[PDB]
Design a protein. Sequence first.
Length: 162
Amino acid sequence: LIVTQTMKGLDIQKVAGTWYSLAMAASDISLLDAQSAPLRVYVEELKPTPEGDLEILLQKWENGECAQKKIIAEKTKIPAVFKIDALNENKVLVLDTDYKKYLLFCMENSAEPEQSLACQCLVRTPEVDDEALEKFDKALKALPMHIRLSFNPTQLEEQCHI
Ligand SMILES: [N]
Ligand SMILES: [Pt+2]
Ligand SMILES: [Pt+2]
């Protein structure tokens, strides 16, 4: 069992725009292990829709190349929980954000979180934000992460982080 506590009172409209994947953590090493790993994904943009769904623009390394993926995340009765069907995942969970600097979120397959859970620390600007990383560490304290990666500004500004 992995238990998640998402942000109460998330206004999805105020997350719109460019983000950078500053850090990642996964329950299973193999999810992130290599450059090719199935959940090694780099957020470019969050685009909320008026009716409160969420488009996720990400980059992923598959066919020798650093390729674009669009994920449609459909809203649920919980503003911080969205339904997806991509990367073999079916849930997006928004743990926390201050809207103007950082956003923490997880994807998982609800059918098996321990082989599935991947969480990221996003920032709006391509700079290491030590506040953001500490919030990510605290949000991860009660999650059973087995791989954790943090990127430097050089890796931030890059195609699939170099
Ligand atoms: N929050
Ligand atoms: Pt909040
Ligand atoms: Pt574990």
